[model samples]
Target: AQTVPYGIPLIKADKVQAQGFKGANVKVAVLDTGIQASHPDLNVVGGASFVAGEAYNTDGNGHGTHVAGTVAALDNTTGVLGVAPSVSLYAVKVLNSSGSGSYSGIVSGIEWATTNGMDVINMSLGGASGSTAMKQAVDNAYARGVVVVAAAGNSGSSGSTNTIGYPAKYDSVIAVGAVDSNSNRASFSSVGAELEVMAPGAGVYSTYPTNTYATLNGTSMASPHVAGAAALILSKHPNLSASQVRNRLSSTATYLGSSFYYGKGLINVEAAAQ
Candidate 1:
């Protein structure tokens, strides 16, 4: 139901398919409503549900599944493919069916991802405020050598300054903003010093609940593109530290040459991989 627009096609699945990283051996943690692991396009390695005893991580909200598909949907001959089709996915259900959750659940998911050997953590949900506990969890993952990426809140054009959200606001995490295909910032993308980069968050095509595919939108969608890029970089340069990977990504990104609204421009997968 929710749909934005694909900011830039630089990191589209088709573009990534040529490089053939396939995200092999990389583990990306999707923290949201969970995913439909049985989906043919998604190769879910395993997952944990922090939704207060929810046995299965199957997506109830559909957001998580779509985000997961964008990161590691298997490169089969059907449905849409992910940026890193060969990568493995770890679904961490921190949000409830209403697409909301507490700081406790988010922190738990982060810890779970770290312990489970996740190379990249993709967080597509966020709140308007910052938290020390959340910051600590993100720091722990960074210390453990995991690439933590999060969505800058979808609060752009709200006429409020410093609206950046937590987890994404954390220094250790790569905070992402949303852009349209024209390289213009999405109207709902939150802005602040927290924004490290921007990606195609609007109108993204990915897997959905019930084994269906849909075109959804949000800074949430954009965050995964950056996460997928990090996975590809990790696959290519396994020795690069989280900081190094972040630097390579942000520095080499397609800078829009505007103010902070665009961050380091768009994510250029071709350039970042080189």
Candidate 2:
């Protein structure tokens, strides 16, 4: 049988556990293309569908499943492990199978997650449009002590305006960019002032649809690294305000590069847990 090593190190895991944040009881809301709740590695507590009144939170596009696995997949002996393996997962299916969803759907999912007691919301999807409803939902979550993390987008070299996509661009949300294990900016990672931090995004191996695993790339993959790290931080300092958690994660980040690609720096779980 072939076995793959966990992407993160055991030292980091120990630090997280020592901090009392094995992600136990923490609920991470993943807003994406749904998830495969049946996966033994994922502890999906419950989920809601925003795809035009649909009632299921199953992953049809595979992206959400992958993202969810990274956030809180169970630490079974047979497959890959997640950063916060003991945490609970909440699936919020905003995007459809085509990997595209309207601003309204995403906003609705954010509102739903916020209302359902999600401690951290991981948005691995984004688009070009902006919405007042989305902004309000994010603000509401932040107000209620819900931490929101979003992707900066995949338009790195396009040299666009550098403005982060909607939801991520919104103030108060943590906008994450992507970097390779070498600590270099991913060629496709979006750049901008909206980028609050960067994380391991290139060649990330995680769960996929149909009970398989693959090495995929995107800001989507990077965002969860931050979310998982935040979970660790929250676990240690559960009473810390949302702003405090955000600052700890950002201020303690490993300094990488100054380019928009590696905003702030690479996410350092060891430093964050300290």
Candidate 3:
């Protein structure tokens, strides 16, 4: 019954680690606001930024640090645990302190992730619009075998027919939605056929700037769960392609309520690892 700060299940993480996994030797890139390089719970190895005056190496905004914590916060005694704490995490800052960024920055970040050898790329930021350049970069990443996970967005309500946001809307990326412990889709979680999975999002606790912890909401939080799950799968099944990983996750998802809103279903990282 090991749990994170907010009672996030560590049993599953322990199960995966027991199998010599925990995303060992896996490379995961988090494209977002940035990360707190000094955060004790984070293991960000390297990074690059497309935003001006914002160093990709430092998380001025807490959003990226929170998302990164969900993906790979260190498995330490005094801090929150992450889904894949041992994965090599790279912070690709495409967003600024305002929780927004340029589409071109996002595209460049994807390109950088692909070019620099990322096995899994987690993009928690989203926009309703898509650009050819952005789509192309995402396609290139998937084409090159990177598992891409993105937020379905926090605009539309549960069961609303609103479309998932860009990059996530693309076929190359796995779109993720938000859900609570009761398996209820978050009220602000966007709905669309493009969504591939759901994960714990509301009030999810993780790392923050200056080595702190906080609870946040949104599909932005949900996406990193799947990202960490991807890393766990890759750690065990290193030979599986991005497509295969996606298939395995979708095929093995737990049957929960509201398929339209939850998509394939709740992503059971522990089950998927097994």
Candidate 4:
């Protein structure tokens, strides 16, 4: 039997999959370190590298591959199933092996994903400062109908301080915060007016480099869950624009906590697809 990560059923993605909505044909770009192209649990269609000396098809830091698995890992008996198991994933290497990158690299990645006709972009990376070029890139992608999703950042500690990171702070992107499987806000999940939604991020289990698996926590993991849900909704409703998809997700989210911390609350992909 295939192991379903708790996040899959936490947001009812398993239910959505049961309805035959596995994000088939939806192109999702994971804008992070990169994705392991040869990972048995992942299917990387193609990608480009913005980093100076890195390959776009491999994850050295293991962050991007983990995020990719949460979004589109293969549904097989050998490994864990993804939120949208059949999604067409693209690897956009914006960060280096050290899990760091310049805003310029990130902006270029946004341009590449948009130009390559990606339907969704899962940016499981963030920085505290905002960049004009980055804002423009995300806005352009959103305008071009690419659903942009990014981590709200892991900079909170039960305080109401506005700590959302940029790109995600931009209105063009969907800022995702973290919550546990029980729908309780993760202590590290950044909160603010820009916060848009919540997803399972605490101790999330997903794929890693070197043909292995790992458990990690961050708003990074949460972002891809919503990104996968966006892919699922797009797979079912291909005609919906990016904003429309955003609206559907917000409207269908299960109200669980404060908007400052939970945004529209935990996303319910099954309801969104239904």
Candidate 2 versus the native: TM-score?
Answer: 0.93
Q: Please report the candidate that would top lDDT against the real structure.
A: 4
Model 1, range 94-142, lDDT digits (tens) per residue?
A: 9988889988988999999999889999999888776888888899999
Clashing pairs in 3: 35-59
| Every model: Cα RMSD to truth | 3.0, 2.2, 2.0, 1.0
For model 3, residues 139-185, the per-residue Cα lDDT tens digits are: 98999999999999988653456668987899999999888766677
lDDT of each: 0.81, 0.80, 0.85, 0.90
What ordering of candidates by lDDT runs from best to worst?
Answer: 4, 3, 1, 2
lDDT of 4 at 255: 94
Candidate 2 per-residue lDDT, tens place, 56-78, comes to: 45787889988887777666676
**Better TM-score candidate (2, 3):** 3
Task: Please rank every candidate by TM-score, starting with the best.
Answer: 4, 3, 1, 2
Supply every candidate's count of residue pairs whose N, Cα or C atoms clash at under 3 angstroms: 8, 1, 1, 0
Task: Provide the global lDDT of candidate 3 against the true structure.
Answer: 0.85
Better of 2 and 3 by lDDT: 3
